[PDB]
Amino acid sequence: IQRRLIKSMESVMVKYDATVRNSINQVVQLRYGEDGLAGESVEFQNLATLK
Amino acid sequence: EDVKLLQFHVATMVDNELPGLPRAMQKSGRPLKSLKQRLKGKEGRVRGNL
Amino acid sequence: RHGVNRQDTGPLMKCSFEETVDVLMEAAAHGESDPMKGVSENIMLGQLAP
DNA sequence: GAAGGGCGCCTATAAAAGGGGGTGGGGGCGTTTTTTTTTTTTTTTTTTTTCGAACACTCGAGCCGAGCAGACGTGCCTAC
DNA sequence: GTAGGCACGTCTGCTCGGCTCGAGTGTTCGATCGCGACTGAGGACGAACGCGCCCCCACCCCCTTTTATAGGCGCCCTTC
Numbered sequence A: 001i002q003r004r005l006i007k008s009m010e011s012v013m014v015k016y017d018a019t020v021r022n023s024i025n026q027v028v029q030l031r032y033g034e035d036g037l038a039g040e041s042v043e044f045q046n047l048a049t050l051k
Numbered sequence B: 001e002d003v004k005l006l007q008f009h010v011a012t013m014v015d016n017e018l019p020g021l022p023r024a025m026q027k028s029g030r031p032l033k034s035l036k037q038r039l040k041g042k043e044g045r046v047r048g049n050l
Numbered sequence C: 001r002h003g004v005n006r007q008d009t010g011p012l013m014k015c016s017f018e019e020t021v022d023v024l025m026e027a028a029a030h031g032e033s034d035p036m037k038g039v040s041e042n043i044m045l046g047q048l049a050p
Numbered sequence D: 001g002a003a004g005g006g007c008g009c010c011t012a013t014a015a016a017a018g019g020g021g022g023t024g025g026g027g028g029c030g031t032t033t034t035t036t037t038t039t040t041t042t043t044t045t046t047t048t049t050t051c052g053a054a055c056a057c058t059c060g061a062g063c064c065g066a067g068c069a070g071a072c073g074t075g076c077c078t079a080c
Numbered sequence E: 001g002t003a004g005g006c007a008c009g010t011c012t013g014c015t016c017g018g019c020t021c022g023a024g025t026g027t028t029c030g031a032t033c034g035c036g037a038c039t040g041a042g043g044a045c046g047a048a049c050g051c052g053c054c055c056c057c058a059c060c061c062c063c064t065t066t067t068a069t070a071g072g073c074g075c076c077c078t079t080c
Helices: A002-009 B002-014 B036-038 B045-049 C011-019 C020-030 C038-045
Strands: A025-028
Touching: B002 B036, B036 B045, B036 C020, B045 C011, C011 C020, C011 C038
Parallel strands: none
Antiparallel strands: none
């Protein structure tokens, strides 16, 4: 299951205008992860206004 | 018959696992390793060496 | 296997995954052109991957 | 009968010449058939988690078009 | 000049042929984690095979007899 999965997604990558596109240069997302943030720099937070 | 035999030998040269067809063998009885088999699996050129 | 091959990616990528000879035979027969734009084709070819 | 003894043929060498015979060397036919009804067996049939679709193919089926035939309508001939 | 009746034309529906549809059956593909790391399988590798035996041909050999020379031995016959 892991080998098959990597084999699909391998060529997707964030380009220098920050839209995420695969090998034939089709757009996957307009911004990576819909906000353009990094996954190792995020944290869990509480939203005050749902009070 | 010669054409049928030639057609078989050149086919078995390229691909030796043809469905419904006998397979090429040796005195050992081992199936021949044709070019498709060499490419095909985990131990094949595409994945194993390349 | 039967879905990834419907993608409009270059033929050499599709060979690197389970289809081996068969996708190359069809690629040769249609005469498609592989633009070496993706990660696998470039690593197999040996030039610095993008 | 069993056993030991005596007589005689055996193989080698030679060397020739005519003719029958053998093991080939190579090509042929690829049979068809005689049956023995066969080693081609059931591998494991599965012990299953089996597909996993995709694609080709099967077979049937229903809508639709043209032609045909009768009913309805029109066109043509005869009699007062 | 005019009206009624027989044949032909018009219209609609039934039958046949033509065109496209799927549940079903078939094929047929495929992969089955990573790595190891050991030997040692090192004797093979028994299968080689006739495939099926067939005829034509080519070439070499066996086939008698001579005589001397000698072990090896098969057979007959008398004695045990």
